[PDB]
Design an enzyme around this catalytic site. Structure first.
Site, PDB file in Angstrom:
ATOM      1  N   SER A 140       6.093   1.362  -9.232  1.00 27.66           N
ATOM      2  CA  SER A 140       7.193   2.194  -7.962  1.00 27.66           C
ATOM      3  C   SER A 140       8.261   1.435  -7.549  1.00 27.66           C
ATOM      4  O   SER A 140       9.077   1.325  -8.520  1.00 27.66           O
ATOM      5  CB  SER A 140       5.990   2.353  -6.867  1.00 27.66           C
ATOM      6  OG  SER A 140       6.361   3.556  -6.025  1.00 27.66           O
ATOM      7  N   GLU A 200       1.498  12.963 -11.248  1.00 26.98           N
ATOM      8  CA  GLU A 200       2.422  12.523 -10.332  1.00 26.98           C
ATOM      9  C   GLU A 200       3.439  13.524 -10.111  1.00 26.98           C
ATOM     10  O   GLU A 200       3.877  14.135 -10.873  1.00 26.98           O
ATOM     11  CB  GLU A 200       3.188  11.248 -10.725  1.00 26.98           C
ATOM     12  CG  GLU A 200       2.643   9.807 -10.690  1.00 26.98           C
ATOM     13  CD  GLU A 200       3.274   8.696 -10.881  1.00 26.98           C
ATOM     14  OE1 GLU A 200       3.106   7.940 -11.938  1.00 26.98           O
ATOM     15  OE2 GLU A 200       4.149   8.461 -10.206  1.00 26.98           O
ATOM     16  N   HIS A 241      -0.188   8.496  -8.778  1.00 23.43           N
ATOM     17  CA  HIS A 241       0.858   7.374  -8.661  1.00 23.43           C
ATOM     18  C   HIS A 241       0.266   6.013  -8.178  1.00 23.43           C
ATOM     19  O   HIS A 241       0.514   5.085  -8.879  1.00 23.43           O
ATOM     20  CB  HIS A 241       1.750   7.714  -7.151  1.00 23.43           C
ATOM     21  CG  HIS A 241       2.993   6.770  -7.125  1.00 23.43           C
ATOM     22  ND1 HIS A 241       3.950   6.689  -7.751  1.00 23.43           N
ATOM     23  CD2 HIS A 241       2.891   6.110  -6.234  1.00 23.43           C
ATOM     24  CE1 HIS A 241       4.900   5.906  -7.340  1.00 23.43           C
ATOM     25  NE2 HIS A 241       4.159   5.234  -6.331  1.00 23.43           N
TER      26      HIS A 241
END
Length: 259
Positions: A140, A200, A241
Site C-alpha cells: 500500500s 481492488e 486490498h
C-alpha cells in the site's frame, strides 16, 4: 511466533527513533539458526513491520531455512497511521499534508536515510548483512515507498517488492519520479516485483479517473521495457486490498533467493 524457540529462525528486536524524535521504531529481526555465509546474510527488509510479522507463518519460515536463508527485518512502530503516512510518502516540490487523511506527509527520503544510516548499522551489530543481496518489501503506502526508492536510488536494493502500491496517491505523483530511471540505473541491476488483487478498487475514492488495474497495467507495460530492470507482475485473482499484504509476503518469501 516471536516468542517461539523451536523454529529454524530466532527473533529479537532493536529500537530506534527518528532523527526528529517524533517516530519510534521497533525492528524485529528474524535470524536463521544457519551460520551466515562469508559475505553475510541476504536481507529482507519489510515495511509495515507490525503487520508483516503477523503474516510470517511457520511453513514459510521452515522452507526459508534452505541453506541460504535470509535475515528478516520487520520495520515496525512502537505505539501507526501518522508514522506510516509521513515515512512512506514522497515530498512534493516547494514549501505537506496527505490528500486523503490530512496527516503530515513527505517523509520518504528521511525514512530512507534513516534506513541506510541508522537501521542498517543497528541490524549489522546483531547479524552480518550482505548489502549486495537486499530486498525491500512494502504494501500500500509501503509499496509507494518501495517505488520511490527504486525510482530515485535504483540498485541500492537488489529486489524491490511493491504490493498494491498506492499509485493513485496525489494524482499519480509517484509516476512523475519514474522519469530518468534508465539513466540512474545505468551499470546496475534490479528486480521489481508488483502485485495487485483483482477485487481492488482503483483508489479509496473508488474508480473516478481510471479503471481498476489500469494504472498498474500502464506502469507494468512501461517498466517491462527497461534495460537492467527485471519486472515481474503477479495479479492475485479475487483478492482485495488487505489480503495482498500477506499474499505478497508469502509469495515473495517463496521466490528463489536474490543473486
Amino acid at each position: 511466533l516471536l516468542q517461539r524457540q523451536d523454529l529454524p529462525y530466532r527473533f529479537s528486536a532493536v529500537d530506534l527513533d527518528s532523527v526528529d524524535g517524533q517516530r519510534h521504531y521497533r525492528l524485529w529481526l528474524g535470524r536463521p539458526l544457519q551460520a551466515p555465509p562469508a559475505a553475510g546474510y541476504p536481507v529482507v527488509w519489510m515495511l509495515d513491520g507490525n503487520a508483516a510479522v503477523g503474516a510470517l507463518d511457520e511453513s514459510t519460515l521452515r522452507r526459508l531455512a534452505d541453506g541460504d536463508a535470509p535475515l528478516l527485518v520487520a520495520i515496525g512502530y512502537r505505539t501507526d497511521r501518522a508514522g506510516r503516512t509521513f515515512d512512506y510518502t514522497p515530498a512534493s516540490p516547494g514549501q505537506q499534508r496527505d490528500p486523503l487523511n490530512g496527516l503530515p506527509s513527505g517523509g520518504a527520503d528521511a525514512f530512507l536515510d534513516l534506513l541506510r544510516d541508522g537501521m542498517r548499522p543497528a541490524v549489522a551489530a546483531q547479524a552480518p548483512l550482505d548489502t549486495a543481496r537486499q530486498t525491500l518489501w512494502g504494501h500500500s503506502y509501503g509499496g509507494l515507498l518501495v517505488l520511490h526508492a527504486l525510482f530515485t536510488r535504483p540498485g541500492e536494493f537488489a529486489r524491490y517488492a511493491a504490493a498494491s502500491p498506492s499509485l493513485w496517491w496525489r494524482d499519480g505523483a509517484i509516476l512523475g519520479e519514474r522519469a530518468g530511471l534508465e539513466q540512474r540505473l545505468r551499470g546496475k541491476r534490479a528486480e521489481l516485483l508488483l502485485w495487485r488483487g483483482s477485487a481492488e478498487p482503483a483508489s479509496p475514492r473508488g474508480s473516478l479517473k481510471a479503471e481498476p488495474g489500469q494504472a498498474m497495467a500502464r506502469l507494468v507495460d512501461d517498466l517491462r521495457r527497461v534495460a537492467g530492470l527485471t519486472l515481474d507482475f503477479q495479479p492475485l485473482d479475487g483478492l482485495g486490498h488487505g489480503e495482498t499484504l500477506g499474499a505478497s509476503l508469502r509469495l515473495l518469501l517463496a521466490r528463489p533467493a536474490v543473486e
